[PDB]
Amino acid sequence: MVRFSRDMLQDGAKRMFKWLRKGEGLPNYLIMYDMDRNKEYKLVPKEYAGLYESRNIFWIKNGREPNYVTLTSVARNPLVMDYQNTNYTACPTSLSLASQMLYHYKSESECAKALGTSKGSGTSPAQLIANAPKLGFKIIPIKRDSKEVKKYLKKGFPVICHWQVNQSRNCKGDYTGNFGHYGLIWDMTSTHYVVADPAKGVNRKYKFSCLDNANKGYRQNYYVVCPA
Amino acid sequence: MVRFSRDMLQDGAKRMFKWLRKGEGLPNYLIMYDMDRNKEYKLVPKEYAGLYESRNIFWIKNGREPNYVTLTSVARNPLVMDYQNTNYTACPTSLSLASQMLYHYKSESECAKALGTSKGSGTSPAQLIANAPKLGFKIIPIKRDSKEVKKYLKKGFPVICHWQVNQSRNCKGDYTGNFGHYGLIWDMTSTHYVVADPAKGVNRKYKFSCLDNANKGYRQNYYVVCPA
Query: Is the CB of B54 less than 8 angstroms away from the CB of A84?
Result: no
Residue B173: other Cβ atoms inside 10 A: 13
Cα A198-A113-A204 angle, rounded to 5 deg? 10
> What is the dihedral sign for C-alpha A135, B64, B26, B153?
positive
Of B61, B72, B176, the CB nearest to A176: B72
In one letter, which amino acid is A93?
Answer: T
| Domains of chain A by residue range | 3-70, 90-227
**Residue whose C-alpha is closest to residue B35's, from B12, B78, B6, B55:** B6
User: Angle between the B108-115 and B90-101 helix axes, to the nearest 10 degrees?
Assistant: 120
Alpha-carbon distances of A224 from A128, A134, A138, A184, B44, rounded to whole Å: 11, 16, 8, 9, 38
User: Angle between the B6-20 and B45-62 helix axes, to the nearest 10 degrees?
Assistant: 120
A183 and A211 Cβ atoms separated by less than 8 Å: no
Determine the Cα–Cα distance for residues B99 and B138; give it in Å rounded to an integer.
Answer: 11
B204 and B188 Cβ atoms separated by less than 8 Å: no
Which residues pair with residue B188 across a beta bridge? B193
In one letter, which amino acid is B46?
Answer: K
Nearest CA in chain A to B64: A85
A53 and A67 Cβ atoms separated by less than 8 Å: no
Start-to-end CA span in chain B (Å): 35
How was this one solved? Answer: X-ray
A32 and A4 Cβ atoms separated by less than 8 Å: yes
H/E stretch holding A216 reads none
**Residue whose C-alpha is closest to residue A135's, from A116, A118, A111:** A111
Q: After which residues, if any, is chain B broken (C to N > 2.5 Å)?
A: none
A51 and A16 Cβ atoms separated by less than 8 Å: no
H/E stretch holding A129 reads helix A125-131
Residues of A at the B interface, defined by Cβ within 8 angstroms:
1, 47, 50, 53-54, 57-58, 60-62, 70-75, 80-81, 83-85, 87, 165, 173-177, 179, 199-203
B184 and B192 Cβ atoms separated by less than 8 Å: no
Residue B87: other Cβ atoms inside 10 A: 16
Determine the Cα–Cα distance for residues B206 and A107; give it in Å rounded to an integer.
Answer: 32
Residue A89: other Cβ atoms inside 10 A: 27
> What is the dihedral sign for C-alpha A206, A210, A212, A215?
negative
Mutate to test the interface with B, among A176, A178, A202 (most CBs of B within 10 A): A176
Nearest CA in chain B to A173: B74
Q: Which CATH number is B90-227 given?
A: 3.90.70.10
Instruction: Indicate the DSSP class of residue A205.
Output: E
Mutate to test the interface with B, among A73, A79, A107, A194 (most CBs of B within 10 A): A73
Secondary structure of residue A210 in the 3-state scheme: helix
Determine the Cα–Cα distance for residues B53 and B42; give it in Å rounded to an integer.
Answer: 17
**Residue whose C-alpha is closest to residue B226's, from B141, B150, B161:** B141
Residue B63: other Cβ atoms inside 10 A: 10
Alpha-carbon distances of B22 from A4, B15, B66, B228, rounded to whole Å: 50, 12, 29, 10
Instruction: Indicate the DSSP class of residue A126.
Output: H
Determine the Cα–Cα distance for residues A92 and A29; give it in Å rounded to an integer.
Answer: 30
- Helix/strand/coil (H/E/C) assignment for every residue in chain B: CCEEEHHHHHHHHHHHHHHHCCCCCCCCCEEEECCCCCCEEEECHHHHHHHHHHHHHHHHHHCCCCCEEECCECCCCCCCCCCCCCCCCHHHHHHHHHHHHCCCCCCHHHHHHHHCCECCCECCHHHHHHHHHHHCEEEEEECCCHHHHHHHHCCCCCEEEEEEHHHHCCCCCCECCCCEEEEEEEEECCCEEEEEECCCEEEEEEEHHHHHCCCCCCCCCEEEEEEC
DSSP for A19-79, please give it. HHTTSS-S-S-EEEE-TTT--EEEE-HHHHHHHHHHHHHHHHHHSS--SEEE--B--SS--
Determine the Cα–Cα distance for residues B89 and B69; give it in Å rounded to an integer.
Answer: 29
B25 and B150 Cβ atoms separated by less than 8 Å: no
Start-to-end CA span in chain A (Å): 36
Determine the Cα–Cα distance for residues B182 and B93; give it in Å rounded to an integer.
Answer: 9
- How far does CA B17 lie from the centroid of its chain? 13
Nearest CA in chain A to B172: A74
**Residue whose C-alpha is closest to residue A150's, from A174, A202, A186:** A186
Residue A140: other Cβ atoms inside 10 A: 15
Of B57, B70, B175, the CB nearest to A73: B175
Residue B51: other Cβ atoms inside 10 A: 26
Residue A192: other Cβ atoms inside 10 A: 17
**Residue whose C-alpha is closest to residue A180's, from A170, A190, A166:** A166
- Which resolution, in Å, applies to this structure? 1.8
Query: Is the CB of A74 less than 8 angstroms away from the CB of B202?
Result: no
